[PDB]
Amino acid sequence: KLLKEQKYDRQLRLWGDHGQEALESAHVCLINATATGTEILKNLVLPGIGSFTIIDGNQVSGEDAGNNFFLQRSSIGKNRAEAAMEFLQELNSDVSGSFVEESPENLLDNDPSFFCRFTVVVATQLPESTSLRLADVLWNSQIPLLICRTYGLVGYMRIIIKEHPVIESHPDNALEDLRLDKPFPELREHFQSYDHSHTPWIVIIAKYLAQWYSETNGRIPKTYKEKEDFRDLIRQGILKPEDEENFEEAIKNVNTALNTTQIPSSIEDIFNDDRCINITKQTPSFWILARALKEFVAKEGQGNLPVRGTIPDMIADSGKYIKLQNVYREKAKKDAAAVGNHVAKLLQSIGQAPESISEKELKLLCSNSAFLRVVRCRSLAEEYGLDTINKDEIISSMDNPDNEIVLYLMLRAVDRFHKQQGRYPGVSNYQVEEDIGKLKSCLTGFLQEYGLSVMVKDDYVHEFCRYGAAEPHTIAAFLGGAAAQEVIKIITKQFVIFNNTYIYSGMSQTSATFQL
Amino acid sequence: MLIKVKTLTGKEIEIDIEPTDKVERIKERVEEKEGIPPQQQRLIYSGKQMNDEKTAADYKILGGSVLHLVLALRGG
Amino acid sequence: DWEGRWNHVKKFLERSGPFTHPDFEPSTESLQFLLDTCKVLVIGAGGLGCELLKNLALSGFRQIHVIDMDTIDVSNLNRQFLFRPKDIGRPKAEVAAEFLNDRVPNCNVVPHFNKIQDFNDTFYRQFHIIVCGLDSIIARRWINGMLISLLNYEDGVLDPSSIVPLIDGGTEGFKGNARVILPGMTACIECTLELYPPQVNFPMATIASMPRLPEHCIEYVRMLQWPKEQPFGEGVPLDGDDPEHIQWIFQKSLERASQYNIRGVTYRLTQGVVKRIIPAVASTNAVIAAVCATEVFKIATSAYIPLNNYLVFNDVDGLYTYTFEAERKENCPACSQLPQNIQFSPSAKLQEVLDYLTNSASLQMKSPAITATNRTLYLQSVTSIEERTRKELGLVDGQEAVADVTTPQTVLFKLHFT
């Protein structure tokens, strides 16, 4: 019981207990159990994912046991899905594994509805046909799909979720919601209420800010100067030349503390989304909370989001800091209640129970009010569609003969070649020579079929033939790590997922995200 | 002069600087916009890792130029 | 050893290509040579370490050594996949080789239950490439100097065959980096030493007088209250892994917090603060180790062009990576071909050097020691120090130098500034 918390400590410090819960309740579906799939799954079993299921029809080959850390020589000839399941199973006894000795295609035929069991579906090393088909089925089924592929020194990764909202965005670095520019009553009263180093830097800036406001009525914009001059105003207040570290600290925070209140552009857009504007019994929890946030802004929020209620640390008297800290804490608590009301009303006008949304959810939302984020991925169909193909992005990126998107195009060509030739370029050594041409033909065919006026160095046509469609472990491993975390993001809904196709080049040790 | 600095998540914000400003200040601009303590900022322009005591001019920065915030990690 | 096994590798050693490193010669004999003769040393065995071992093993390496002074702990099991609960208590390097040598048929991993400082040049010269998955800055700095001291300059001209490629990986939460160092050519660990963020240090003034955060309460019960009242017997040190010690600190912290009525003291935070814990997960380590491994392969096979010394990665917001060629400081106290020729005072007293070395952000040495000529000035490293560990005559005795420093394990080398 408590033994788990010891085993998962290092990660609990990242997504906390609730994240861990989400994870231990999920069920993942890995399509092919190659190195890529095996590595991705490895990074999910270790963390303690609830349960997984491997769907592989293929038999473990010689080269399969050669690049997979979860298939031994002893399992060559057996089912690749079952073989891997056993070895992966060993990593964590708290994870329950399962397998299906059939192909994706087979399942998509005899039973499409099968994938509705899964929280997420990770597919690896699939051919165009199977992807487009699976992508389609799952898109309609509302199932998150992540297509992963290792080809030579290239890592491919495309995520497909119609809409993924996230509250606990977890931003590295944000501005403090101190709001000196638009103080609230309680805050103002606190400042009026006023061991020289024992005084919080905020109260310091507030005092001199008030003074400056009298002798001006000005807020102190004029970056380069006014702020710089505001500093000198603070300096002329240091105890006869005693020291004052916090004073000098306040002077440094002046670069921040001035304007720290304004609704984030990204949130404005959430507010303006049809999903937020037009609510219905259909509307999911996230959007109802977003509306409540918007309503708040309009009414008691008076133009801004609920007060965060958290302040940075600051050299100051033990009791003074704690008092200051409560002013925000208490205010925040209030704004939260206000937002809460708007929720209940909204729920009622929809017919849902006022308690359809926990207080926990409410409190968390209000803390992250300024960091909400929504991601929406284009369907795989829209990308492959002749009219919808986002050529603006492709052509634009291709302005660099070596932009990672070269690799994307090459992958499409390789796919064309495969659809065409029924096999991949240069798999056998002697085929290389010949295929280099046949491949460029497909490349050009592909580029024309979509009207993509782009120049692709012939070098890349060579390289991919050299690759012989190999699945190098170190490459598969890289992808395995990145993919797993995106999957964990989907499950926990705790961070921000990349938007659409991610491309990694082991050659240059570089990568980029494309589309959207 | 209008330069761009890419965050450690590749955000990329735009900043106004005159070739006379110190690297030190370029960081203040970044903080001012992103809330990233200058203490933990490490800027990189074409290989050189900008010393916050020199000037933007010192590193041949010009309008369109792009700076990158970077880091090195301890764990393993 | 069996049909098909190395197919995923052969293609890169048997075929030529557009991006192949110049010295590359496509060969059918290459693979076997790699397997039989290329000696690679992995430093560290816990996340990056485990991951590294697997990557190299499945890439065509057999002659692999691993150093690691640690013992398996329950809290390694969420990412260090070569250890099981049954192995808890055992030596990491041991279990790691044990596992790998079994999982990957003919691997020949040799474990070394030691700390990098136990060895000397003789030992490190043995390897063709060294990959790190260390967990401290000091260690990276130490091994960095060691690989540099192996350099051999034939009359100012560096002999290339004395260069031992050093690939370093780092991790911290969802962030990580990888770099490729060619001592005596590429920027060294020292050259980029300032890329490491500052460590959040609490001024004791607030720790002892004005606590505000739970961390302050805990830092107190650990830094002051424990010593001041030998909790588990006199002389007995605080063991951050001792559940009972943490329990005592957690307790005394709840009390201190309650005094200044600060909320937020949790058992988990107590461990974090006491152990200066870094959040970690399997995913990030997998990514960095994979990059580093790929780079080791390139270096050993010339199948491609080696990364240009630096890559940063971040998972929090989508997927971001910045790759860049870090400039090699020409005055690197470490990789500088010649002595560090720089005077920091006309000629007054001593302290005004010990501090320059200790605080200069580009040196950041720890309890250094200066040697003149052939006497020792200050040392810090017991009584031997004392005598001299407690000046203008000598602050004149050298006159215009080659004063000679050595920092406590910061470097294996003896840094010679003038």
Swiss-Prot record, chain A:
CDD domains from the UniProt entry: APPBP1_RUB
Tissue: Ubiquitous in fetal tissues. Expressed throughout the adult brain.
UniProt KW Iron-sulfur keyword: no
Positions bearing the site annotation: Interaction with UBA3: H198
Stretches the record annotates as Interaction with UBA3: 313-326
Keywords: Acetylation, Apoptosis, Cell cycle, Cell membrane, Disease variant, Intellectual disability, Membrane, Ubl conjugation, Ubl conjugation pathway
Pathway: Protein modification; protein neddylation
GO cellular component, one term: plasma membrane
Any one Gene Ontology molecular-function term assigned to this protein's record: ubiquitin protein ligase binding
Cellular compartments annotated: Cell membrane
Superkingdom assignment: Eukaryota
Transmembrane intervals: none
Outcome recorded upon mutating R80Q: In NEDFIH; uncertain significance; decreased protein abundance in homozygous patient cells; patient cells show a decreased amount of neddylated proteins
GO BP: mitotic DNA replication checkpoint signaling; neuron apoptotic process; protein neddylation; regulation of apoptotic process; regulation of neuron apoptotic process; regulation of postsynapse assembly; signal transduction
PTM comment, free text: Ubiquitinated by TRIP12, leading to its degradation by the proteasome.
Activity regulation comment: Binding of TP53BP2 to the regulatory subunit NAE1 decreases neddylation activity.
Residues bearing PTM N6-acetyllysine: K1, K323
InterPro entries in UniProt: APP-BP1, ThiF/MoeB/HesA, ThiF_NAD_FAD-bd, Ubiquitin-activating_enz
Family stated for the protein in its record: Belongs to the ubiquitin-activating E1 family. ULA1 subfamily.
Subunit and interaction comment: Heterodimer of UBA3 and NAE1. The complex binds NEDD8 and UBE2M. Binds APP and TP53BP2.
Disease: Neurodevelopmental disorder with dysmorphic facies and ischiopubic hypoplasia: An autosomal recessive disorder characterized by moderate to severe global developmental delay, facial dysmorphism, and ischiopubic synchondrosis hypoplasia. Affected individuals show infection-triggered lymphopenia, and loss of developmental milestones associated with epileptic spasms. Diminished white matter volume, enlarged ventricles, and thin corpus callosum are visible on brain imaging.
Listed name of the protein: NEDD8-activating enzyme E1 regulatory subunit
Organism per entry: Homo sapiens
Gene that specifies this protein: NAE1
From Swiss-Prot, chain B:
GO cellular component terms, A-Z: cytoplasm; cytosol; extracellular exosome; glutamatergic synapse; nucleoplasm; nucleus; postsynapse
UniProt GO BP: anatomical structure morphogenesis; modification-dependent protein catabolic process; protein localization; protein modification process; protein neddylation; proteolysis; regulation of postsynapse assembly; regulation of proteolysis
Statement: the UniProt record of this protein carries the keyword Oxidoreductase: no
Gene3D superfamilies assigned: Phosphatidylinositol 3-kinase Catalytic Subunit, Chain A, domain 1 (3.10.20.90)
Modification (Microbial infection) Deamidated glutamine, positions: Q40
Effect of A72R: Prevents adenylation by UBE1C
Cross-linked residues, Glycyl lysine isopeptide (Gly-Lys) (interchain with K-? in acceptor proteins): G76
Modification(s) after translation: Cleavage of precursor form by UCHL3 or SENP8 is necessary for function.
InterPro entries the record matches: Nedd8-like, Ubiquitin-like_dom, Ubiquitin-like_domsf, Ubiquitin_CS, Ubiquitin_dom, Ubiquitin_ubiquitin-like
Record's subcellular location: Nucleus
Site, Interaction with UBE1C: residue positions: L8, I44
Tissue expression remark: Highly expressed in heart, skeletal muscle, spleen, thymus, prostate, testis, ovary, colon and leukocytes.
Pfam families: ubiquitin
GO molecular function annotation: protein tag activity; ubiquitin protein ligase binding
Chief location bin: nucleus
Residue(s) carrying N6-acetyllysine: K48
Renumbered residue ranges of the record's region Interaction with UBE1C: 70-72
Keyword annotations: Acetylation, Isopeptide bond, Nucleus, Ubl conjugation pathway
PROSITE patterns (UniProt xref): UBIQUITIN_1, UBIQUITIN_2
Highest rank taxon of the organism: Eukaryota
The protein's assembly and partners: Interacts with AHR; interaction is direct. Interacts with NUB1; interaction is direct. Interacts with ESR1.
Family designation: Belongs to the ubiquitin family.
Its biological purpose: Ubiquitin-like protein which plays an important role in cell cycle control and embryogenesis via its conjugation to a limited number of cellular proteins, such as cullins or p53/TP53. Attachment of NEDD8 to cullins is critical for the recruitment of E2 to the cullin-RING-based E3 ubiquitin-protein ligase complex, thus facilitating polyubiquitination and proteasomal degradation of cyclins and other regulatory proteins. Attachment of NEDD8 to p53/TP53 inhibits p53/TP53 transcriptional activity.
Entry protein name: Ubiquitin-like protein NEDD8
Taxonomy of the source species: Eukaryota, Metazoa, Chordata, Craniata, Vertebrata
Swiss-Prot record, chain C:
Binding site for ATP: 68-92, 116-139
Effect of I278A: No effect on NEDD8 adenylation or thioester intermediate formation; impairs NEDD8 transfer to UBE2M
SMART domains tied to this protein: E2_bind
Effect of Q337P: No effect on NEDD8 transfer to UBE2M
Protein name: NEDD8-activating enzyme E1 catalytic subunit
Result, substituting R388A: No effect on NEDD8 transfer to UBE2M
Subunit details: Heterodimer of UBA3 and NAE1. Interacts with NEDD8, UBE2F and UBE2M. Binds ESR1 and ESR2 with bound steroid ligand. Interacts with TBATA.
A biological-process GO annotation: protein modification process
The organism of origin for this protein: Homo sapiens (Human)
Effect of mutating T376A: Impairs NEDD8 transfer to UBE2M
Outcome of substituting L379A: Impairs NEDD8 transfer to UBE2M
Region (Interaction with NAE1): 210-216, 260-263
